[PDB]
């Protein structure tokens, strides 16, 4: 009656894990001599990419078990590492530093942040030495001894050696598109209310993901995607407090950041072909770095987040926002890098609200040059100073939060900003993507018989 008929090219797939390859704009590669996140390891992108709607297809997605996020983590860290191998290693700079206060033009907030430090340094000739001065930040220098000798050491020098970023290499995140090799497909959830888990009734297949900028930040997702309809609350388990809650804004909050100091860059020769760039002298008055957010915009977005949180924690629960309990500087402050300078902003103003069931904010930011990226101990880098005044505009497109546990009373829920792991920063963009394996061989009954 019925016989086996073999079909090749059937639209059947299974969940799979593969090694994806990027796609990037060749244009920006011509504009960008080098970018830490290499466009050379990657490939030029294809204009007019294709997205086919898989009508009548409902696919199961898991934002919290996605290997695209892990591959992105591996790729970004490895791209950073190879972008920092050729650059100069600042081992000769691990010397005693005689440091004194800088009080030329200082406001009461910036008192003691910068120090004038003198030290003996190597020169291009191995038989001669020089005494050179540079300004250093309090966060990059540690007292050598308890006694007030005013002798200082760089924080890394005990545990590790600190590389210097090449001055030519740029830090601007450029979009990268993650593409699937032959025999694999990327399925994109087109549902506008999806929380990253469970069945997705609106699915499409894409050659490559949308351009994702590797923006490294804590407590606030910058320059990311925005929710189409409503603020999106996404946690692996919302009841669990050990899992960070990722918030997506439907409307961004514009944030204006600046370091008003007019900085200079001083070349110091430490070897035959090796240079060390230093802070030089700050032309003009010295004022603290800070960031401005619109207060009304922040309050309206916070109300929207409160409404979405109430959808998960009760209709009469009190949603309180408070600031970080503690930890390293990266997590306790809104850490980010824009222009090549690494900022650290106190977001206590941002999270200072109790929401009962019924003009700008200025954030004092701090600057550092010794940066330990990606929660690794022993691989610090020195950020060369950026010359001039830096002004900086970004969109706050989301939050990373942690809910306080052990609540004695059940009417309130406290949420504090968090971060530090960028797998939860890059999972807020890849939440709607899953890679699948095509199984093109099928066998089905038909009445047809081989002669």
């Amino acid at each position: 009656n019925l016989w086996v008929t073999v079909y090749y090219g059937v639209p059947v797939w299974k969940d799979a894990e593969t090694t994806l390859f990027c796609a990037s704009d060749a244009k920006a590669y011509e504009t960008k001599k080098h970018n830490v996140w290499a466009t050379h390891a990657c490939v030029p992108t294809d204009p007019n990419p294709q997205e086919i709607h898989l009508e009548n297809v409902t696919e199961e997605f898991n934002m919290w078990k996605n290997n695209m996020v892990e591959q992105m983590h591996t790729d970004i860290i490895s791209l950073w590492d190879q972008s920092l191998k050729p650059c100069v290693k600042l081992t000769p700079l691990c010397v005693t530093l005689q440091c004194t206060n800088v009080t030329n033009n200082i406001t009461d907030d910036m008192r003691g942040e910068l120090k004038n430090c003198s030290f003996n340094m190597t020169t291009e000739l191995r038989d001669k030495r020089q005494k050179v001065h540079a300004l250093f930040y309090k966060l990059d220098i540690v007292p050598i001894n308890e006694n007030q000798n005013t002798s200082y050491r760089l924080i890394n020098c005990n545990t590790a050696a600190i590389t210097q970023a090449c001055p030519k290499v740029s830090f601007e995140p450029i979009p990268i598109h993650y593409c699937a090799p032959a025999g694999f497909a990327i399925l994109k959830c087109k549902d506008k209310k999806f929380n990253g888990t469970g069945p997705c009734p609106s699915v499409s297949t894409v050659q490559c993901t949308h351009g994702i900028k590797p923006v490294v930040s804590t407590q606030l997702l910058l320059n990311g995607s925005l929710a189409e309809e409503e603020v999106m609350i996404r946690s692996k388990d919302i009841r669990n407090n050990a899992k960070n809650i990722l918030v997506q804004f439907n409307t961004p909050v514009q944030i204006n950041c600046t370091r008003p100091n007019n900085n200079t860059r001083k070349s110091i020769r430490i070897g035959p072909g090796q240079w060390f760039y230093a802070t030089g002298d700050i032309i003009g008055d010295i004022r603290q770095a800070h960031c401005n957010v619109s207060k009304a915009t922040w309050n309206e977005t916070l109300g929207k987040v409160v409404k979405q949180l109430r959808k998960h924690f009760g209709n009469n629960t009190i949603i309180r926002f408070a600031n970080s309990s503690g930890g390293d500087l990266e997590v306790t402050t809104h850490s980010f890098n824009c222009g090549g300078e690494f900022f650290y902003c106190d977001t206590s103003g941002l999270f200072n609200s109790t929401w009962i069931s019924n003009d700008s904010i200025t954030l004092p930011c701090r600057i550092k040059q010794i940066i330990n990226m990606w929660q690794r101990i022993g691989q610090a880098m020195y950020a060369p100073p950026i010359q001039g005044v830096i002004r900086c505009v970004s969109n706050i497109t989301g939050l990373i939060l942690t809910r306080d546990g052990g609540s004695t009373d059940s009417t309130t829920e406290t949420f504090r900003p968090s971060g530090g792991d960028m797998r939860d920063n890059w999972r807020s963009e890849l939440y709607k993507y899953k890679v699948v394996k095509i199984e093109p061989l099928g066998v089905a009954p038909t009445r047809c018989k081989r002669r």
Partner: antibody
Framework: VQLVQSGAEVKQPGASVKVSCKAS????????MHWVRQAPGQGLEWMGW????????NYAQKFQGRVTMTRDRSISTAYMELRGLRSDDTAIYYC????????????????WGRGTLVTVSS | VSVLTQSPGTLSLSPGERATLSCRAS???????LAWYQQKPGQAPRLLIY???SRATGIPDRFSGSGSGTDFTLTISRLEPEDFAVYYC?????FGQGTKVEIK
């Protein structure tokens, strides 16, 4: 796989105690570290956790303001400092490492610490 | 947090018979997230059940448990002499009051 804590100690009201928890055998950065309170003749009582990789701690509302947990990654040791001590704070303080289950429900304390009694007296 | 009530306060049996210790979660949504801990006197707790039903590595098969939603139970099949302790149920950060299994 072992967590050795500090020795038992006696303190006055108003002082500050700092229990510690050295870890051996497992990668200290991969797991969270929780601090749990067993008062005498009472049930277990969770206080907080700390992420070793970041240092970001979560506290219980009763211990908010009075407890500070820290870590030193180099020596794979965690600390919990209960300031502003009082009479009811007399209890054994364990350090617990949740195990790596399949659902990432990191609340299954397979590895506890032996304990460190803090006796508050006048 | 989630309230856990672990009844009965004190349960008096004798060796070799089956005891059925129960925990009831109140302020939850209902899932398979529970653990059973054994704490002998003078010792720190020890994990027996990791999940609604699964068993921690190394624990004998006499210790078994089940449940779902908001009602769970620990079933000690054989009350061997090294099985008398305080048993606790854990839902995330919350802990039960404690059940005493005492010889009688």
């Amino acid at each position: 796989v072992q967590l050795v804590q500090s020795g038992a100690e006696v303190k006055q009201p108003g002082a500050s105690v700092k229990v510690s928890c050295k870890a051996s055998g497992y990668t200290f950065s991969d797991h969270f570290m929780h601090w749990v309170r067993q008062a005498p003749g009472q049930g277990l009582e969770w206080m907080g956790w700390i992420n070793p990789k970041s240092g970001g701690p979560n506290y219980a509302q009763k211990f908010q303001g009075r407890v500070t947990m820290t870590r030193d990654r180099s020596i794979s040791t965690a600390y919990m400092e209960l300031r502003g001590l009082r009479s009811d704070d007399t209890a054994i303080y364990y350090c617990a490492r949740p195990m790596h289950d399949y659902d990432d429900h990191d609340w299954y304390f397979d590895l506890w610490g032996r304990g460190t009694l803090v006796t508050v007296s006048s | 947090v989630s309230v856990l009530t672990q009844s009965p306060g004190t349960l008096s049996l004798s060796p070799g018979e089956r005891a059925t210790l129960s925990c009831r979660a109140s302020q939850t949504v209902g899932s398979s997230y529970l653990a059973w801990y054994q704490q002998k006197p003078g010792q720190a707790p020890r994990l027996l059940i990791y999940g609604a039903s699964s068993r921690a590595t190394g624990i004998p098969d006499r210790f078994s448990g089940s449940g779902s939603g908001t009602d769970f139970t620990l079933t000690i099949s054989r009350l061997e002499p090294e099985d008398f302790a305080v048993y606790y149920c854990q839902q995330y950060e919350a802990f039960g009051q404690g059940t005493k299994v005492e010889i009688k």
